[PDB]
Amino acid sequence: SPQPLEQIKLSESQLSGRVGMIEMDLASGRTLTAWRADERFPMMSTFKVVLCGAVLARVDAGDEQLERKIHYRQQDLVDYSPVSEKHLADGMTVGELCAAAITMSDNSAANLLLATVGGPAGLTAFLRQIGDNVTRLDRWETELNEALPGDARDTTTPASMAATLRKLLTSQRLSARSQRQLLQWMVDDRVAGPLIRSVLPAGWFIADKTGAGERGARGIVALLGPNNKAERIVVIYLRDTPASMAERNQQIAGIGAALIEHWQR
Ligand SMILES: OC[C@H]1O[C@H](O[C@H]2[C@H](O)[C@@H](O)[C@H](OCCCCCCC3CCCCC3)O[C@@H]2CO)[C@H](O)[C@@H](O)[C@@H]1O
Ligand SMILES: OC[C@H]1O[C@H](O[C@H]2[C@H](O)[C@@H](O)[C@H](OCCCCCCC3CCCCC3)O[C@@H]2CO)[C@H](O)[C@@H](O)[C@@H]1O
């Protein structure tokens, strides 16, 4: 494979779309690869990691409990609710909601949680509290995936999202137990985690959250490294490409292949 930057460029050529990418050391925050790092991309379901960071901050402060059971109604549900649609009668705990949002991309679970943090505006305020002055959430599921060309709503930048993930996972803004919980939810992703493992060489750690939207939007926020260690944050977003889902997946994986082959930088 090409060097990572050259593979990223080839992916833009091939997709006709914009790619944004950061590769960052998790422990130190060193930026390794950066491409369109300050450009905006729709977050799509990748926002759900930040969402559950805000939930966990409430838990640490004594303002929420992961045990707390939320009852909700069928008329509340939005498109794609594989877990939450099963619990109309008995409800779900806040922690179960975060697990369904992160590990199954359950959209209604995400909206229920978003309401507990004060909606898109409240999650944006949480981002500002942790020093992310760029990432913004404006809408709920599923409109936040619309990815209109040139629309700043519901966007992050690769640099912002990488720095924010690192803050949530490592900076002691969250309690030790809450940092461990957020990481385990990403480890447990069922949407893409098993598929990624099936194509990773032996020894490579993965934890992730993926997203998809209109006009080719696609993204992943992940932890990756050899020796079974979460060594680096890797954030990749794609936008404004007409390519098939399969080809967008393949191009993201090809960037991953370049990272794996040129890991020592
Ligand atoms: O197995 C050996 C091959 O390994 C790589 O090939 C990669 C390729 O670079 C990538 O483009 C493709 O993607 C196939 C699709 C994989 C889907 C999983 C990726 C993720 C990304 C975000 C969420 C969806 C799933 O995989 C092949 C391996 O099979 C090297 O590029 C190639 O030189 C080598 O010969
Ligand atoms: O020399 C390095 C390795 O090169 C190949 O591995 C291939 C592998 O066979 C293929 O399936 C993968 O596709 C890439 C799959 C990427 C999945 C991670 C993607 C995510 C993770 C983080 C966020 C962004 C994308 O590429 C690697 C590197 O060529 C050999 O198969 C393997 O024996 C060898 O150890």
The residues spanned by each domain of the chain are: 1-265
- Alpha-carbon distance of 188 to 181, in angstroms, equals 10
- Alpha-carbon distance of 158 to 43, in angstroms, equals 10
Q: Which ligand is nearest to the CA of 219?
A: 1
3-state secondary structure of 249: helix
Ligand 1 touching residue 257 (CB < 6 A): yes
* Rg of the Cα atoms in the chain: 17
Residue at token pair 């079974």: 228
HSE of 37, CA atoms in CB hemisphere, 13 A: 14
- Which amino acid residue places its CA nearest to atom 28 of ligand 1? 199
Residues annotated within a binding site for a beta-lactam: 48, 105, 141
45 catalytic residue (yes or no): yes
11 catalytic residue (yes or no): no
- 1, 21, 191, 237: residue to mutate for ligand 1 pocket, most atoms within 8 A of CB: 1
- Which amino acid residue places its CA nearest to atom 26 of ligand 2? 257
Take residue 55 and report the two structure tokens written for it.
């939930």
Ligand 2: centre distance to CA 125 (Å): 38
The structure was resolved to a resolution in Å of 1.1
Nearest CA to 259 out of 230, 217, 228, 224 is that of 224
Can you spell out the DSSP letters for the chain?
Answer: ---HHHHHHHHHHHHSSEEEEEEEETTT--EEEEESTTS-EE-GGGHHHHHHHHHHHHHHHTS--TT-EE---GGG--S--TTGGGGTTT-EEHHHHHHHHHHH--HHHHHHHHHHTTHHHHHHHHHHHTT-SS------TTGGG---TT--TTEE-HHHHHHHHHHHHHSSSS-HHHHHHHHHHHHT-SSSHHHHHHHSPTT-EEEEEEEE-STT-EEEEEEEESTT---EEEEEEEES----HHHHHHHHHHHHHHHHHT---
Take residue 138 and report the two structure tokens written for it.
């404006």
Asked whether the bond before 241 is cis by omega within 30 degrees of 0, the reply is no
**Sign of the Cα pseudo-torsion (55, 60, 66, 67, in order):** negative
Ligand 1 touching residue 220 (CB < 6 A): yes
Ligand 1 touching residue 259 (CB < 6 A): no
Ligand 1 touching residue 44 (CB < 6 A): no
Rounding to the nearest 10 degrees, give the CA dihedral for residues 83, 88, 89, 94: 60
Question: What CATH number should be reported for the domain whose range is 1-265?
Answer: 3.40.710.10
Ligand 2: centre distance to CA 206 (Å): 12
Method: X-ray
- Alpha-carbon distance of 254 to 248, in angstroms, equals 10
Nearest CA to 77 out of 51, 104, 112 is that of 112
User: What are residue 31's DSSP bridge partners?
Assistant: 24
Nearest CA to 237 out of 80, 40, 103 is that of 40
